[PDB]
Symmetry: C3
Subunit: 268 residues, 3 copies
């Protein structure tokens, strides 16, 4: 919901509507139907129609939508689509650089916004962005930010620089009282070992999950985020409950126990 | 005093005043009597009484006091204890989240304040906190910060995040012209090798010392901060002569790190 | 060029004017004649004259000049030297701490300014510094910053802190639209392996090049920055999107074209 951990948010282009149910069947916590960078300019109207048809034909489906930003002439149409279909439970706003951009998207759609930091200018304004009314949680465009800062993506030095963006997302999350952020996409679909390392690092620094681009990435993300059997056995008992193994059942312990349950996908 | 290196600041819970003597004789640069985290809510009123009894009974003792946070009902009573006893030479303000909290504590106690940065809010306001009137030096609550940001304490990623926080504390120390800061408590009392690593890393990035939780940690901390014989020879000469401001200042820093401030 | 990659900027002390021609033939992208730290206080006036005579005697020479900081009594004379010689194509301003220091140097010299961030104060005011009129690009004074922050130079902890400071230069470069910055001097002239690693790390985080202190450092810097065969192929084609043109140009400049 607007406060649980999202372990995985899987992109699927609106140009491939047959892949939308496949994305939903992958077990990803959230599916993001993309109308933005994965859809060539000449196919945006067709893509929007494809998404409309999916939502009308599958009313129980729940998805996020990555819309075109305000500079694009289809921004209003994208927002209207988000506004008019109950199945759209939030939208990703790319290239976010101001609080105003967020508010416009949140009010026009009436839906929660996930600002995606993709530039240095967005990072510099993250304080105001994160504090904007309508923001659910933050994420960032790892590749896009690397390009904006002329980094050699994948290098240790680039990761050190991206660490600043990560720190900012984590700090602003806490300051603004947002839901757990998502780490950026790990693009090497064939490198399962590398994905696991990326997930471990994100988890260890307080991210709830990762943005992802192929159904095959879901299993390893979920596996790496999963707490131990012992932590879950304890967490479940603490959730129900009070003295549970010694400590009291206070907000810090429920927040702890309930965070374990959400990392295991046993929230709500 | 308000400018020297403090290599070690050892905590002793106010519920255990019988342990204060050992702390004061451990060689620790400062002893901190704690009224906060190490004292259960139900025993805070009592713990405050124990400290007050220790101060009156031991008028020569010199200690720091870690008071309860600003939003705690006992904050005023903690500040009154710090104000009324000459043996209290400063107070640690936990969970500092604004310059305004520092000012209230500084004016009410009339004693130097040591803000402990241990929350995101604290980091966000570190510029104004460090520059507030009454601040002696900053300290880092690494474990509390880790909890506040949901970090996996001890992991490589967590250490990267804590690096961002340490950088803020060190940069603001310099900008605000504060005395050398203290790095966080290393909790593994039975892991000397771990402690030594934590001290050397802290020292290498400009920290003056570490907060500590058991007398046995004082010796390894002091040993790891002790400058080499070479540094001390050179330092004692530059001191006797007192060569520009920064250079002479570094000579003193070496002498203080050797406990010859 | 005021917006190209500078792969290497080689320091030569003004007390050694005879070494300037060697530095200018080393292949270094820029030569920096130093009037600051490499010159003892008692020789600064003599050194300034050495440079002036060198510039008068050698009009085709193109150099940067590292002047004395704003608070040094010779700051005005150093600036006048930069103003009066057409061969001075820019100046390095040490221990920059305000936009006002940059504007003073830029107006008094009429030349581009290269602020050197070497103090906590400079870091704190970097947004204003980077945005000041006359700034070409930023450079990092890692050894002087390590002194200002009481770091143990060369240690892991010190490099972690320095990394945080490097980020500020990289971020402000992008926000202020400056030319590619230069990373700090790698002091171990005899450790070629360590130099190569320092250059690779710098390049990977977005630095255009390194400040250097010996001509033997130039070749390894240029070789480490040299893109692969495929990267240039693509770069040469795109030469013969606006941000893509920027990346293509960056590649060619890293290859010395």
């Amino acid at each position: 919901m607007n406060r649980q951990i999202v372990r995985s948010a899987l992109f699927v282009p609106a140009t491939r509507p047959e892949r939308i149910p496949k994305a939903l069947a992958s077990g990803a916590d959230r599916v993001i139907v993309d109308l933005e960078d994965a859809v060539e300019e000449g196919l945006k109207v067709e893509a929007r129609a494809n998404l409309r048809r999916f939502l009308v034909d599958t009313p129980e489906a729940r998805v996020l939508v990555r819309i075109n930003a305000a500079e694009h002439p289809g921004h209003a149409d994208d927002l209207a689509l988000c506004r008019d279909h109950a199945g759209v439970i939030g939208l990703l706003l790319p290239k976010v650089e101001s609080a105003a951009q967020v508010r416009h998207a949140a009010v026009a759609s009436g839906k929660p916004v996930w600002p995606i930091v993709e530039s240095a200018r967005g990072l510099a304004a993250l304080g105001e962005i994160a504090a904007a009314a309508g923001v659910e949680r933050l994420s960032f465009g790892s590749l896009d930010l690397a390009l904006d800062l002329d980094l050699n993506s994948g290098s240790n030095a680039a990761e050190q620089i991206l660490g600043h963006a990560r720190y900012a997302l984590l700090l602003q999350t806490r300051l603004a009282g947002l839901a757990p952020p998502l780490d950026g996409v790990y693009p090497a679909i064939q490198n399962r070992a590398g994905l696991v390392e990326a997930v471990r690092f994100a988890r260890d620094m307080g991210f709830g999950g990762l943005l992802c681009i192929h159904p095959s990435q879901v299993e390893p993300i979920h596996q790496t985020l999963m707490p131990s059997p012992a932590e879950l056995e304890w967490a479940r008992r603490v959730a129900e409950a009070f003295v549970v193994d010694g400590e009291m059942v206070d907000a810090p312990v429920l927040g702890r126990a309930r965070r374990l349950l959400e990392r295991a996908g046993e929230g709500g």
